[PDB]
Amino acid sequence: LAQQSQGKALTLLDASEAQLDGAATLVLTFSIPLDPEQDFSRVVHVVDAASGSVDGAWELAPNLKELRLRHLEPERVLVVTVDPAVKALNNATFGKSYEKTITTRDVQPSVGFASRGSLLPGKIAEGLPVMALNVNHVDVNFFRVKPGSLASFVSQWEYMADLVYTGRFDLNPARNTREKLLLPLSDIKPLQQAGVYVAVMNSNAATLFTLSDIGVSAHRYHNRLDIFTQSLENGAAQSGIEIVLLNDKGQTLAQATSDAQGHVQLEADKAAALLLARKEEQTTLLDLTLPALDLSEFNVAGAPGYSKQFFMFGPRDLYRPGETVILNGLLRDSDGKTLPDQPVKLEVVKPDGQVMRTVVSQPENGLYRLNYPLDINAPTGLWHVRANTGDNLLRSWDFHVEDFMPERMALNLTAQKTPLAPADEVKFSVVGYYLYGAPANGNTLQGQLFLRPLRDAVAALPGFQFGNIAEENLSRSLDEVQLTLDKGGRGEVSAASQWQEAHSPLQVILQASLLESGGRPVTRRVEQAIWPADTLPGIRPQFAAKAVYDYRTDTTVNQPIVDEDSNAAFDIVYANAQGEKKAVSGLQVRLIRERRDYYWNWSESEGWQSQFDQKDLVEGEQTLDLNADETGKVSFPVEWGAYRLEVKAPNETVSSVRFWAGYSWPDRVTLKLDKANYRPGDTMKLHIAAPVAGKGYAMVESSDGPLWWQAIDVPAQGLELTIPVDKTWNRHDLYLSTLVVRPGDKSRSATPKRAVGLLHLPLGDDNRRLDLALESPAKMRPNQPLTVRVKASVKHGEMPKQINVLVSAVDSGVLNITDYATPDPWQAFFGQKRYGADIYDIYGQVIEGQGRLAALRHVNIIAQQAQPITLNEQGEGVVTLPIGDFNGELRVMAQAWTADDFGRGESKVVVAAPVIAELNMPRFLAGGDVSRLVLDVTNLTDRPQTLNIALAASGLLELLSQQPQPVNLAPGVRTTLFVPVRALEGFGEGEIQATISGLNLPGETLDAQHKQWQIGVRPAWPAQTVNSGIALAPGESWHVPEQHLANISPATLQGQLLLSGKPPLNLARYIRELKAGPYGCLEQTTSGLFPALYTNAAQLQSLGITGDSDEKRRAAVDIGISRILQMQRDNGGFALWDENGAEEPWLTAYAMDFLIRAGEQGYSVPPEAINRGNERLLRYLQDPGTMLIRYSDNTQASTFAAQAYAALVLARQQKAPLGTLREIWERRSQAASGLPLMQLGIALNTMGDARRGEEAITLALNTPRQDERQWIADYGSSLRDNALMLSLLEENNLRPDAQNALLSSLSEQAFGQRWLSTQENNALFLAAHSRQASAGAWQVQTSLEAQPLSGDKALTRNLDADQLAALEVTNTGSQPLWLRLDSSGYPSSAPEPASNVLQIERQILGTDGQRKSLSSLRSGELVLVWLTVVADRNVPDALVVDLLPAGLELENQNLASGSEVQNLLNQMQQADIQYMEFRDDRFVAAVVVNEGQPVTLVYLARAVTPGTYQLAQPQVESMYAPQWRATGASEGLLIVTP
């Protein structure tokens, strides 16, 4: 607003100092608002008449009339100046200059202790810190707590004393400056004597401090507490009393007196706050609620040490919505040994925390297995698999769900294949293009160049590594790439050589991204090899890389390792890029030992750090000569540590390979061990070294509690102990702790009094790892089974036997997205577990340390996992992995296990195709659409190719052009073929098969190349239906009305004829109509799911319905249940479209009802959902105020309906409070229909009170549904309500003579046909389902077959176009016959636009805001679709559907240049849109329509594929009064040009 201020001048109301924020603030108050803009500096000034200028941070309150300046130093003379300006929001300005002098107050006095006090004891314990300000003295009283009520007193503190006053300390700080001062008491002694003291003044007026000699240390576990009491003074070792307390609370939990070694053991969980240790009169206290000692510095990291170790693993952790999540599990004990068979409770958790599935997982041959099919509309984010083994210590396996977008453009980057000399500059060639056949013109290419070492430089020689691994400046970032490229799809990047001195093979990597103009980039990368010589040496170790743990990454990595004190063999060659081994003489082969000497080093910006100085030593040297076609084989004797083999040739080129001979690759207590890796029965000698001599104790412990401990006196020479290993110690969470304490309480030297030591206890075994060898070809071809051979080894002893191996294969990219490391069970079971105890101490706190270190360096995915195999006698196996299409790198993984041993194996397999063929096409097609498909074919071989391409069209799709001519492609060249196609009438899918013949390859010959692409084909126009029926007396005839045939095309015309000897119900129609989406909302799913619950295929085929092998039906119901669960809110309630949408009680009751019904039929539903749902229903019943029904006209009726249905649903579960049901029954007059009364009646009958129930029923049967189609939020109609009432009657076996009558009347009432809601269909289905019509003879003569039709049950039969076009029926029975005919088909002519209540209109605008013709559109052109909906009523369930032409694709964007398009957008964001979705072929929008308020819906679309496309009419309807429909005038066709 701010125009109320116009007409007013600008006068300064008040400039003065005021208390704000708690400090002195200069405040200027003007008469009218100021600009919040940034100009207060050279317009309004404050200058000290002594110190000059000061802080000019002019602040402005959100109130625009007050200008502020905070924090003013007191007793200062400030001159405030306001010069003629300060602007005035009505540009009224300020007249002239104004100056005012100010004195800036004096701050209020203040005294108080700097802290509430601590519990750290002291011999004399001096120094009481206080924060004083403008106070020259302070009185202090000193109290000593009574030993009697000590506990309680201290207990009321943190979460009653004598008086020993001395007082009045003289504190003289500088004026107006808060100073920190120390109160002394050393010269005082009615105070030195031991005890607990409290100092109090006349804002932290009180503080506590303790004087004692008892030093106390404590180790806490998850439910055990060990205490050690020793001397603060004379070294260590002390007896005495100590007790455990309860926070705030007073009491005593547990008491103890320490032994001759000071150790004590008390069992206590949490809620054990205060620890009190006392003796005679000396008392030391320890608060166990405070933060424990920080051990981030120590190597105590790792997984938790559980009693039962459950290793969960899978092929990957990145899935998309739709595909199935695979999970595997293995269960062992603390030492990785087999436990008795047991179930594990697995739960699937989606990002919001709600459970999606709960399964009691049973093992199969010792392997737990889980498959979770993600819904196509599953939420994206971090999912968890939550495992419970029984200890209620939930294990968690995380996995990501992400949906990837198609990238709309194609980028090609090519290089020169063969290596280059260092002198040469590198030229990359770029080729970018749109997939719909257009070259990328004017597109910005943005990339970057990198330089990296090339160690795998010879494909003909796998394993052989090249280049000096110790050569500097081989990995650095080069130039950035900015290429505006503006040409018809061609470009080039050039990189000048900054590499010359290089003696190792390099590769330069270009990584570039192609751009639209500012979005969805297409990123690609290409590398160029670079050699310093046409020929150079290569090294391949003969020994296989072993599996070892890497804490750096926390992953089990493969490394070249050989045994200690042994011989390392290597294969040396001297070769070029292409071909094989060449001759040479005088290869300088050196074995270089890399020696590293470590040393600690301290700074303060990062504290203590572990440094190391390195040096390379020559420990071996050989000289070699090689002939043509010869693999040199050298052997060097090695000992321990890190080595590297170096090979140097006369051409100054070097190749090096690093490896290890050992599997091992100051302010604290230094702990060292004689050995690495121990066994059960060994004995370990512990070397303890402390900076300063002292006393304390060493301990061997873990989780639960300690296993060994011994008090020690450490001199300044170090101290060696001998610890025996008993093996109840097999937990891998064993830690060796050490506490040392200095004698003197006070000291020179500074010197920490307390010092701690903590080391992990090695206990693993080398011969419990399965060493896996996965053999498979480095390269292969698509659509050919991948053979993988497994060979296991175990170092010492013999191959275990019955080794279980699980092999998998996954696209390396998907794994690279998440940096997914191959799971290893060995590390999972035998890995270093964390230190599972908390150290509480009374000596000086650990200060910081500042932390542990760290490390530093599509559409349709291939991810397979074969069945678990069992290796043979010698531990050999073979697995076959069917590889589909795919062109790239596959990671082959393997997890092996026995009863005691475990293993992991990896391998890499490059899947490449000689020629690649990709077909670009639209997302779907409509019957009659003519479209131009784009087939891109590229030859990747080294030879030129003459290819014969053969194309075939299958399904609802046909070709229009003749077969392509043979094509001649040079190596690396891409050709483009255009395939004009037309879609056929029908609803299904069309397919394009491609076959490439020729290809000519040496070595292989290779079967022809086969490919096949899918596309969805749907009718352009909505399906039209015609329903009729009649009652035939004996002898009467009947012919098909011409309505069923009029203006609809044959071959799409299906019919269903229903014949019955009694008032029938079109069950088949209900079922068919209940099964056609959209996937959309909650009910449609529910209602659509209801039939699949109670009807099997046997019952379906009787009604003329095929499909469903019953198990797919089960799967479908499961999928449905998931889709239902995906919309349950956090409070157990349900919503219409999404989980974050408004809550609908009735639908909650509905979904719950279905879920219970599903549970009854043996389907799995997670108890959390059921329970929270039931709770929400109970809260609906007991607290109606929580409800919020939207867009209702009669909240009373809505509420009553909700409560009624909820009451029934809970009554079925025997969880409905009868008192509440009656309390609802008293409100029966609020019912706007009989259905809620019926439901409530059944609930009453179920929960006891039959009378009032039968009353409710009898009342229901005489309570018609009447209302001016408001909404009521019950999703209802008279038909529906009658149907459901009949259903409830039939389901409970109640009133016959009524159900018969109005079953007939319902059968005749069902003639409110044409359009029924899903709810009406479901109700009718239930009514028809639960009815037992019994016997009713009928005979009839028809035109379908010579013999007469006959039966005693209602018979349904399917009819094609010919049978239906000439249907005659004549009753030949002794009694009347009921006949129903249901016809359905698609129109031969475009139907006339129609409207009822609702009105829909569509206009097509350009981005300029002007109308556009849908016939001059070129590919890549943008258009705004403008939908206008209007009605004369309130339609809270207005579903808008706009079928797309296949030529147009949607831009997924919810809208809330410029122009008055914004005027439409503004009106769009005024509409209350309940839901909106952008399908491939549909624009769908669920909205509410208000009376006399036009709803505007604009959406963006792009033309992509050239062709002629059918165009449908915009459709809108009420979802639950579907007679309110509107279709609104279409132009008929869409033309897209290239």
Side-chain angles (χ1 to χ4, degrees), residues 99-116:
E99 172 169 272
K100 189 193 182 190
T101 303
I102 292 291
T103 307
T104 59
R105 246 274 193 181
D106 282 336
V107 292
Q108 230 63 22
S110 180
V111 197
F113 290 104
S115 176
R116 271 235 192 170

PDB file of all heavy atoms in Angstrom, residues 99-116:
ATOM      1  N   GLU A  99      20.602  19.016  13.524  1.00  0.00           N
ATOM      2  CA  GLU A  99      21.680  18.461  14.337  1.00  0.00           C
ATOM      3  C   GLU A  99      21.278  18.409  15.808  1.00  0.00           C
ATOM      4  O   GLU A  99      20.723  19.372  16.340  1.00  0.00           O
ATOM      5  CB  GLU A  99      22.958  19.285  14.163  1.00  0.00           C
ATOM      6  CG  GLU A  99      24.079  18.894  15.115  1.00  0.00           C
ATOM      7  CD  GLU A  99      25.408  19.527  14.752  1.00  0.00           C
ATOM      8  OE1 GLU A  99      26.154  18.932  13.946  1.00  0.00           O
ATOM      9  OE2 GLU A  99      25.708  20.621  15.275  1.00  0.00           O
ATOM     10  N   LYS A 100      21.551  17.277  16.455  1.00  0.00           N
ATOM     11  CA  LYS A 100      21.242  17.111  17.874  1.00  0.00           C
ATOM     12  C   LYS A 100      22.378  16.421  18.623  1.00  0.00           C
ATOM     13  O   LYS A 100      22.891  15.392  18.186  1.00  0.00           O
ATOM     14  CB  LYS A 100      19.948  16.312  18.050  1.00  0.00           C
ATOM     15  CG  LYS A 100      19.439  16.270  19.486  1.00  0.00           C
ATOM     16  CD  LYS A 100      18.349  15.230  19.668  1.00  0.00           C
ATOM     17  CE  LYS A 100      17.822  15.228  21.094  1.00  0.00           C
ATOM     18  NZ  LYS A 100      16.926  14.069  21.363  1.00  0.00           N
ATOM     19  N   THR A 101      22.758  16.996  19.760  1.00  0.00           N
ATOM     20  CA  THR A 101      23.782  16.414  20.621  1.00  0.00           C
ATOM     21  C   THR A 101      23.139  15.482  21.643  1.00  0.00           C
ATOM     22  O   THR A 101      22.058  15.767  22.162  1.00  0.00           O
ATOM     23  CB  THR A 101      24.594  17.504  21.350  1.00  0.00           C
ATOM     24  OG1 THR A 101      25.173  18.392  20.387  1.00  0.00           O
ATOM     25  CG2 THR A 101      25.707  16.887  22.195  1.00  0.00           C
ATOM     26  N   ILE A 102      23.809  14.366  21.918  1.00  0.00           N
ATOM     27  CA  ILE A 102      23.301  13.355  22.841  1.00  0.00           C
ATOM     28  C   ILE A 102      24.407  12.814  23.737  1.00  0.00           C
ATOM     29  O   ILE A 102      25.517  12.550  23.275  1.00  0.00           O
ATOM     30  CB  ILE A 102      22.667  12.167  22.082  1.00  0.00           C
ATOM     31  CG1 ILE A 102      21.387  12.600  21.361  1.00  0.00           C
ATOM     32  CG2 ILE A 102      22.374  11.001  23.031  1.00  0.00           C
ATOM     33  CD1 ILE A 102      20.227  12.944  22.282  1.00  0.00           C
ATOM     34  N   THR A 103      24.091  12.648  25.019  1.00  0.00           N
ATOM     35  CA  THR A 103      24.951  11.903  25.932  1.00  0.00           C
ATOM     36  C   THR A 103      24.348  10.510  26.083  1.00  0.00           C
ATOM     37  O   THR A 103      23.134  10.368  26.229  1.00  0.00           O
ATOM     38  CB  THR A 103      25.083  12.587  27.301  1.00  0.00           C
ATOM     39  OG1 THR A 103      25.494  13.948  27.122  1.00  0.00           O
ATOM     40  CG2 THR A 103      26.110  11.858  28.153  1.00  0.00           C
ATOM     41  N   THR A 104      25.197   9.487  26.049  1.00  0.00           N
ATOM     42  CA  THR A 104      24.728   8.118  25.851  1.00  0.00           C
ATOM     43  C   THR A 104      24.690   7.253  27.113  1.00  0.00           C
ATOM     44  O   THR A 104      25.155   6.114  27.098  1.00  0.00           O
ATOM     45  CB  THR A 104      25.601   7.401  24.805  1.00  0.00           C
ATOM     46  OG1 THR A 104      26.966   7.388  25.241  1.00  0.00           O
ATOM     47  CG2 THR A 104      25.504   8.104  23.464  1.00  0.00           C
ATOM     48  N   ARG A 105      24.125   7.785  28.195  1.00  0.00           N
ATOM     49  CA  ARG A 105      23.767   6.972  29.361  1.00  0.00           C
ATOM     50  C   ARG A 105      24.957   6.312  30.063  1.00  0.00           C
ATOM     51  O   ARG A 105      26.104   6.433  29.631  1.00  0.00           O
ATOM     52  CB  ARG A 105      22.776   5.879  28.937  1.00  0.00           C
ATOM     53  CG  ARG A 105      21.383   6.007  29.526  1.00  0.00           C
ATOM     54  CD  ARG A 105      21.287   5.358  30.896  1.00  0.00           C
ATOM     55  NE  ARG A 105      19.900   5.218  31.331  1.00  0.00           N
ATOM     56  CZ  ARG A 105      19.529   4.701  32.497  1.00  0.00           C
ATOM     57  NH1 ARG A 105      20.439   4.277  33.363  1.00  0.00           N
ATOM     58  NH2 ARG A 105      18.241   4.612  32.800  1.00  0.00           N
ATOM     59  N   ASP A 106      24.658   5.628  31.164  1.00  0.00           N
ATOM     60  CA  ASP A 106      25.601   4.730  31.826  1.00  0.00           C
ATOM     61  C   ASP A 106      24.904   3.398  32.082  1.00  0.00           C
ATOM     62  O   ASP A 106      23.764   3.365  32.545  1.00  0.00           O
ATOM     63  CB  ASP A 106      26.116   5.326  33.140  1.00  0.00           C
ATOM     64  CG  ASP A 106      27.184   6.384  32.930  1.00  0.00           C
ATOM     65  OD1 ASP A 106      27.850   6.365  31.875  1.00  0.00           O
ATOM     66  OD2 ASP A 106      27.363   7.230  33.829  1.00  0.00           O
ATOM     67  N   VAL A 107      25.589   2.302  31.775  1.00  0.00           N
ATOM     68  CA  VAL A 107      24.983   0.977  31.873  1.00  0.00           C
ATOM     69  C   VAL A 107      24.726   0.567  33.318  1.00  0.00           C
ATOM     70  O   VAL A 107      25.417   1.007  34.238  1.00  0.00           O
ATOM     71  CB  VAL A 107      25.861  -0.101  31.200  1.00  0.00           C
ATOM     72  CG1 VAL A 107      25.895   0.113  29.700  1.00  0.00           C
ATOM     73  CG2 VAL A 107      27.271  -0.105  31.784  1.00  0.00           C
ATOM     74  N   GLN A 108      23.722  -0.284  33.502  1.00  0.00           N
ATOM     75  CA  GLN A 108      23.333  -0.747  34.828  1.00  0.00           C
ATOM     76  C   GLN A 108      24.378  -1.710  35.394  1.00  0.00           C
ATOM     77  O   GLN A 108      24.938  -2.515  34.650  1.00  0.00           O
ATOM     78  CB  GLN A 108      21.966  -1.432  34.773  1.00  0.00           C
ATOM     79  CG  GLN A 108      20.975  -0.941  35.819  1.00  0.00           C
ATOM     80  CD  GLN A 108      20.621   0.524  35.644  1.00  0.00           C
ATOM     81  OE1 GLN A 108      20.774   1.085  34.559  1.00  0.00           O
ATOM     82  NE2 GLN A 108      20.152   1.153  36.716  1.00  0.00           N
ATOM     83  N   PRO A 109      24.647  -1.631  36.712  1.00  0.00           N
ATOM     84  CA  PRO A 109      25.597  -2.574  37.319  1.00  0.00           C
ATOM     85  C   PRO A 109      25.160  -4.030  37.171  1.00  0.00           C
ATOM     86  O   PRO A 109      23.978  -4.294  36.949  1.00  0.00           O
ATOM     87  CB  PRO A 109      25.613  -2.158  38.794  1.00  0.00           C
ATOM     88  CG  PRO A 109      25.184  -0.736  38.795  1.00  0.00           C
ATOM     89  CD  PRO A 109      24.204  -0.606  37.673  1.00  0.00           C
ATOM     90  N   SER A 110      26.103  -4.959  37.297  1.00  0.00           N
ATOM     91  CA  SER A 110      25.792  -6.378  37.166  1.00  0.00           C
ATOM     92  C   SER A 110      26.924  -7.257  37.690  1.00  0.00           C
ATOM     93  O   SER A 110      28.097  -7.012  37.405  1.00  0.00           O
ATOM     94  CB  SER A 110      25.504  -6.724  35.704  1.00  0.00           C
ATOM     95  OG  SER A 110      25.191  -8.098  35.555  1.00  0.00           O
ATOM     96  N   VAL A 111      26.559  -8.278  38.462  1.00  0.00           N
ATOM     97  CA  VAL A 111      27.516  -9.259  38.961  1.00  0.00           C
ATOM     98  C   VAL A 111      26.910 -10.652  38.846  1.00  0.00           C
ATOM     99  O   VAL A 111      25.689 -10.810  38.877  1.00  0.00           O
ATOM    100  CB  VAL A 111      27.911  -8.997  40.430  1.00  0.00           C
ATOM    101  CG1 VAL A 111      29.195  -9.744  40.782  1.00  0.00           C
ATOM    102  CG2 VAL A 111      28.068  -7.507  40.697  1.00  0.00           C
ATOM    103  N   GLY A 112      27.763 -11.660  38.708  1.00  0.00           N
ATOM    104  CA  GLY A 112      27.302 -13.031  38.609  1.00  0.00           C
ATOM    105  C   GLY A 112      28.425 -13.992  38.279  1.00  0.00           C
ATOM    106  O   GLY A 112      29.380 -13.632  37.589  1.00  0.00           O
ATOM    107  N   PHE A 113      28.313 -15.219  38.778  1.00  0.00           N
ATOM    108  CA  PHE A 113      29.302 -16.249  38.494  1.00  0.00           C
ATOM    109  C   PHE A 113      29.287 -16.601  37.011  1.00  0.00           C
ATOM    110  O   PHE A 113      28.224 -16.704  36.399  1.00  0.00           O
ATOM    111  CB  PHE A 113      29.039 -17.495  39.342  1.00  0.00           C
ATOM    112  CG  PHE A 113      29.318 -17.299  40.806  1.00  0.00           C
ATOM    113  CD1 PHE A 113      28.280 -17.132  41.708  1.00  0.00           C
ATOM    114  CD2 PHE A 113      30.619 -17.285  41.280  1.00  0.00           C
ATOM    115  CE1 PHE A 113      28.536 -16.952  43.054  1.00  0.00           C
ATOM    116  CE2 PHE A 113      30.881 -17.106  42.624  1.00  0.00           C
ATOM    117  CZ  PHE A 113      29.839 -16.941  43.513  1.00  0.00           C
ATOM    118  N   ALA A 114      30.474 -16.781  36.440  1.00  0.00           N
ATOM    119  CA  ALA A 114      30.610 -17.074  35.018  1.00  0.00           C
ATOM    120  C   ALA A 114      29.954 -18.402  34.654  1.00  0.00           C
ATOM    121  O   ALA A 114      29.537 -18.605  33.513  1.00  0.00           O
ATOM    122  CB  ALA A 114      32.075 -17.089  34.624  1.00  0.00           C
ATOM    123  N   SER A 115      29.874 -19.302  35.629  1.00  0.00           N
ATOM    124  CA  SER A 115      29.286 -20.620  35.419  1.00  0.00           C
ATOM    125  C   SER A 115      28.479 -21.064  36.631  1.00  0.00           C
ATOM    126  O   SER A 115      28.679 -20.568  37.740  1.00  0.00           O
ATOM    127  CB  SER A 115      30.382 -21.646  35.118  1.00  0.00           C
ATOM    128  OG  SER A 115      29.841 -22.949  34.996  1.00  0.00           O
ATOM    129  N   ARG A 116      27.566 -22.004  36.411  1.00  0.00           N
ATOM    130  CA  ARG A 116      26.787 -22.589  37.497  1.00  0.00           C
ATOM    131  C   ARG A 116      27.663 -23.428  38.422  1.00  0.00           C
ATOM    132  O   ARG A 116      27.221 -23.852  39.492  1.00  0.00           O
ATOM    133  CB  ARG A 116      25.654 -23.455  36.940  1.00  0.00           C
ATOM    134  CG  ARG A 116      24.354 -22.713  36.665  1.00  0.00           C
ATOM    135  CD  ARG A 116      23.195 -23.375  37.393  1.00  0.00           C
ATOM    136  NE  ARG A 116      21.897 -22.873  36.954  1.00  0.00           N
ATOM    137  CZ  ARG A 116      20.732 -23.416  37.297  1.00  0.00           C
ATOM    138  NH1 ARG A 116      20.697 -24.485  38.082  1.00  0.00           N
ATOM    139  NH2 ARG A 116      19.598 -22.892  36.851  1.00  0.00           N
TER     140      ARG A 116
END
